[PDB]
């Protein structure tokens, strides 16, 4: 009944606007039907550059998602995923931004699986995510499963097990999957 | 829509090429992109026929160092000297041309058209500066030239390596002159082309990149007011300059815009962009897994 959920969404040029449209209509529907046990939400859009759209407080004061999410727009840069990771857990998952003591930390990365131009690699930002206990789901988009390195970068983003951590974007099941994964917590 | 590109070559010095480029860029987009199914397929040689009529006519006025001007007795130029060379790098797709001719051209372009420092002074400007795209009234004297030479040369690399082993030097020191002196430019045109040639030499990594990358207006164009042909051409320079680092982020933006402009080649003067418009739209589909 303690719970803090973050969103690290890819906003790179490899995200086509429909993917971005579909990200916004997706992240919303998770919110609307999940005002539960005081579930707390934060988002940050990442690309070559990064934008904390709301922290937990800015979120705590306004609970109406559709009003929150419609205006969010695209950044059209490269893909700095891992550098966006540490910034979420160091900035969004700081108490100074609304993070509650003794809450469950989950991060929902919405990316297309192609790390690009990140001066940080992935090997830096995961075992810190392990040492600090964020549950890391990955919501892969577009052509993320067609090729090889794009799906492998995903399982490298998600925590183990991946059968409960890595999901597809179109499936509207992941939310029920965390919903029941919390429901039993 | 693209039915207005097979054109009649004509004209003393370069209009044959002016007509040869829309006659050579079609068979280069259409072919690689597997678009040879709506028409019936009986023309393909007609173009190669058309091509063997113009490029051959383009050789009615060779010069002793294999040089090319519009005019023979004249001291020959270097834009038509190397640009008809680049119109041929797309000809190799289908047409049968010989190869000693270009290496016998480049040997002169390095013995008498490059300075110890990587400069390239066009020791003969031409009478048709409308065919040249965005090279007329820029201040940047010979930066845009030094890289336009470099790209024309490097387009037909791994070709003139046997007959002329001088070439790699002219490429390197010209690109060196670029990289040490690429950051200090103002306009995007010069940004775009010289970025690509360092990309040809693989050397487009670093702040030199940032400036070129930066200059993207809304991430989908290199904005200048000179003419859309300058912007559309340099967008197609940066796009080829993009496929060479295998970027698949900044590419769809460009593709989007480059596919809302609804340009399909055509018009007096519309010579440079025509080539580049579909040369880059073609190499795109060659790399992009579809
Ligand atoms: Mg990307």
mmCIF file with all atom_site columns, N, CA and C and ligand atoms in Angstrom, chain A residues 10-15 46 77-81 111-116, chain B residues 247-250, ligand 1:
data_model
loop_
_atom_site.group_PDB
_atom_site.id
_atom_site.type_symbol
_atom_site.label_atom_id
_atom_site.label_alt_id
_atom_site.label_comp_id
_atom_site.label_asym_id
_atom_site.label_entity_id
_atom_site.label_seq_id
_atom_site.pdbx_PDB_ins_code
_atom_site.Cartn_x
_atom_site.Cartn_y
_atom_site.Cartn_z
_atom_site.occupancy
_atom_site.B_iso_or_equiv
_atom_site.pdbx_formal_charge
_atom_site.auth_seq_id
_atom_site.auth_comp_id
_atom_site.auth_asym_id
_atom_site.auth_atom_id
_atom_site.pdbx_PDB_model_num
ATOM   1  N  N   . UNK A 1 10  ? 11.192 6.993  -23.822 1.00 0.00 ? 10  UNK A N   1
ATOM   2  C  CA  . UNK A 1 10  ? 12.061 7.455  -24.888 1.00 0.00 ? 10  UNK A CA  1
ATOM   3  C  C   . UNK A 1 10  ? 11.355 8.536  -25.695 1.00 0.00 ? 10  UNK A C   1
ATOM   4  N  N   . UNK A 1 11  ? 12.043 9.644  -25.916 1.00 0.00 ? 11  UNK A N   1
ATOM   5  C  CA  . UNK A 1 11  ? 11.485 10.695 -26.732 1.00 0.00 ? 11  UNK A CA  1
ATOM   6  C  C   . UNK A 1 11  ? 12.368 10.980 -27.928 1.00 0.00 ? 11  UNK A C   1
ATOM   7  N  N   . UNK A 1 12  ? 13.217 10.022 -28.324 1.00 0.00 ? 12  UNK A N   1
ATOM   8  C  CA  . UNK A 1 12  ? 14.169 10.185 -29.422 1.00 0.00 ? 12  UNK A CA  1
ATOM   9  C  C   . UNK A 1 12  ? 13.486 10.229 -30.790 1.00 0.00 ? 12  UNK A C   1
ATOM   10 N  N   . UNK A 1 13  ? 14.252 10.664 -31.789 1.00 0.00 ? 13  UNK A N   1
ATOM   11 C  CA  . UNK A 1 13  ? 13.720 10.740 -33.140 1.00 0.00 ? 13  UNK A CA  1
ATOM   12 C  C   . UNK A 1 13  ? 13.312 9.396  -33.713 1.00 0.00 ? 13  UNK A C   1
ATOM   13 N  N   . UNK A 1 14  ? 13.853 8.309  -33.177 1.00 0.00 ? 14  UNK A N   1
ATOM   14 C  CA  . UNK A 1 14  ? 13.415 6.988  -33.579 1.00 0.00 ? 14  UNK A CA  1
ATOM   15 C  C   . UNK A 1 14  ? 12.029 6.662  -33.072 1.00 0.00 ? 14  UNK A C   1
ATOM   16 N  N   . UNK A 1 15  ? 11.460 7.480  -32.197 1.00 0.00 ? 15  UNK A N   1
ATOM   17 C  CA  . UNK A 1 15  ? 10.065 7.320  -31.816 1.00 0.00 ? 15  UNK A CA  1
ATOM   18 C  C   . UNK A 1 15  ? 9.230  8.115  -32.808 1.00 0.00 ? 15  UNK A C   1
ATOM   19 N  N   . UNK A 1 46  ? 12.940 11.441 -21.932 1.00 0.00 ? 46  UNK A N   1
ATOM   20 C  CA  . UNK A 1 46  ? 14.362 11.466 -22.204 1.00 0.00 ? 46  UNK A CA  1
ATOM   21 C  C   . UNK A 1 46  ? 14.623 11.295 -23.689 1.00 0.00 ? 46  UNK A C   1
ATOM   22 N  N   . UNK A 1 77  ? 15.439 13.990 -30.235 1.00 0.00 ? 77  UNK A N   1
ATOM   23 C  CA  . UNK A 1 77  ? 16.856 13.709 -30.182 1.00 0.00 ? 77  UNK A CA  1
ATOM   24 C  C   . UNK A 1 77  ? 17.251 12.249 -30.372 1.00 0.00 ? 77  UNK A C   1
ATOM   25 N  N   . UNK A 1 78  ? 18.413 11.921 -29.795 1.00 0.00 ? 78  UNK A N   1
ATOM   26 C  CA  . UNK A 1 78  ? 19.000 10.585 -29.750 1.00 0.00 ? 78  UNK A CA  1
ATOM   27 C  C   . UNK A 1 78  ? 18.418 9.799  -28.584 1.00 0.00 ? 78  UNK A C   1
ATOM   28 N  N   . UNK A 1 79  ? 19.053 8.691  -28.215 1.00 0.00 ? 79  UNK A N   1
ATOM   29 C  CA  . UNK A 1 79  ? 18.543 7.821  -27.155 1.00 0.00 ? 79  UNK A CA  1
ATOM   30 C  C   . UNK A 1 79  ? 19.580 7.677  -26.033 1.00 0.00 ? 79  UNK A C   1
ATOM   31 N  N   . UNK A 1 80  ? 19.489 8.526  -25.001 1.00 0.00 ? 80  UNK A N   1
ATOM   32 C  CA  . UNK A 1 80  ? 20.337 8.396  -23.804 1.00 0.00 ? 80  UNK A CA  1
ATOM   33 C  C   . UNK A 1 80  ? 19.500 7.749  -22.694 1.00 0.00 ? 80  UNK A C   1
ATOM   34 N  N   . UNK A 1 81  ? 19.354 6.422  -22.757 1.00 0.00 ? 81  UNK A N   1
ATOM   35 C  CA  . UNK A 1 81  ? 18.478 5.737  -21.800 1.00 0.00 ? 81  UNK A CA  1
ATOM   36 C  C   . UNK A 1 81  ? 19.108 5.654  -20.418 1.00 0.00 ? 81  UNK A C   1
ATOM   37 N  N   . UNK A 1 111 ? 10.665 2.502  -24.228 1.00 0.00 ? 111 UNK A N   1
ATOM   38 C  CA  . UNK A 1 111 ? 11.758 2.779  -25.141 1.00 0.00 ? 111 UNK A CA  1
ATOM   39 C  C   . UNK A 1 111 ? 11.651 1.846  -26.346 1.00 0.00 ? 111 UNK A C   1
ATOM   40 N  N   . UNK A 1 112 ? 12.403 2.147  -27.400 1.00 0.00 ? 112 UNK A N   1
ATOM   41 C  CA  . UNK A 1 112 ? 12.434 1.298  -28.578 1.00 0.00 ? 112 UNK A CA  1
ATOM   42 C  C   . UNK A 1 112 ? 13.672 0.408  -28.634 1.00 0.00 ? 112 UNK A C   1
ATOM   43 N  N   . UNK A 1 113 ? 14.475 0.367  -27.578 1.00 0.00 ? 113 UNK A N   1
ATOM   44 C  CA  . UNK A 1 113 ? 15.574 -0.583 -27.484 1.00 0.00 ? 113 UNK A CA  1
ATOM   45 C  C   . UNK A 1 113 ? 16.812 -0.293 -28.303 1.00 0.00 ? 113 UNK A C   1
ATOM   46 N  N   . UNK A 1 114 ? 17.134 0.984  -28.522 1.00 0.00 ? 114 UNK A N   1
ATOM   47 C  CA  . UNK A 1 114 ? 18.359 1.284  -29.271 1.00 0.00 ? 114 UNK A CA  1
ATOM   48 C  C   . UNK A 1 114 ? 19.114 2.417  -28.547 1.00 0.00 ? 114 UNK A C   1
ATOM   49 N  N   . UNK A 1 115 ? 20.001 2.049  -27.613 1.00 0.00 ? 115 UNK A N   1
ATOM   50 C  CA  . UNK A 1 115 ? 20.822 3.046  -26.933 1.00 0.00 ? 115 UNK A CA  1
ATOM   51 C  C   . UNK A 1 115 ? 21.766 3.702  -27.928 1.00 0.00 ? 115 UNK A C   1
ATOM   52 N  N   . UNK A 1 116 ? 21.829 5.027  -27.865 1.00 0.00 ? 116 UNK A N   1
ATOM   53 C  CA  . UNK A 1 116 ? 22.453 5.775  -28.942 1.00 0.00 ? 116 UNK A CA  1
ATOM   54 C  C   . UNK A 1 116 ? 22.880 7.129  -28.399 1.00 0.00 ? 116 UNK A C   1
ATOM   55 N  N   . UNK B 2 247 ? 22.861 6.320  -37.947 1.00 0.00 ? 247 UNK B N   1
ATOM   56 C  CA  . UNK B 2 247 ? 21.809 6.884  -37.116 1.00 0.00 ? 247 UNK B CA  1
ATOM   57 C  C   . UNK B 2 247 ? 20.456 6.412  -37.611 1.00 0.00 ? 247 UNK B C   1
ATOM   58 N  N   . UNK B 2 248 ? 19.598 6.008  -36.678 1.00 0.00 ? 248 UNK B N   1
ATOM   59 C  CA  . UNK B 2 248 ? 18.195 5.729  -36.982 1.00 0.00 ? 248 UNK B CA  1
ATOM   60 C  C   . UNK B 2 248 ? 17.287 6.409  -35.965 1.00 0.00 ? 248 UNK B C   1
ATOM   61 N  N   . UNK B 2 249 ? 17.701 7.597  -35.506 1.00 0.00 ? 249 UNK B N   1
ATOM   62 C  CA  . UNK B 2 249 ? 16.921 8.491  -34.655 1.00 0.00 ? 249 UNK B CA  1
ATOM   63 C  C   . UNK B 2 249 ? 16.488 9.751  -35.398 1.00 0.00 ? 249 UNK B C   1
ATOM   64 N  N   . UNK B 2 250 ? 17.463 10.559 -35.854 1.00 0.00 ? 250 UNK B N   1
ATOM   65 C  CA  . UNK B 2 250 ? 17.255 11.824 -36.551 1.00 0.00 ? 250 UNK B CA  1
ATOM   66 C  C   . UNK B 2 250 ? 16.805 11.642 -37.979 1.00 0.00 ? 250 UNK B C   1
HETATM 67 MG MG1 . LIG C 3 .   ? 16.249 6.316  -30.596 1.00 0.00 ? 1   LIG C MG1 1
#
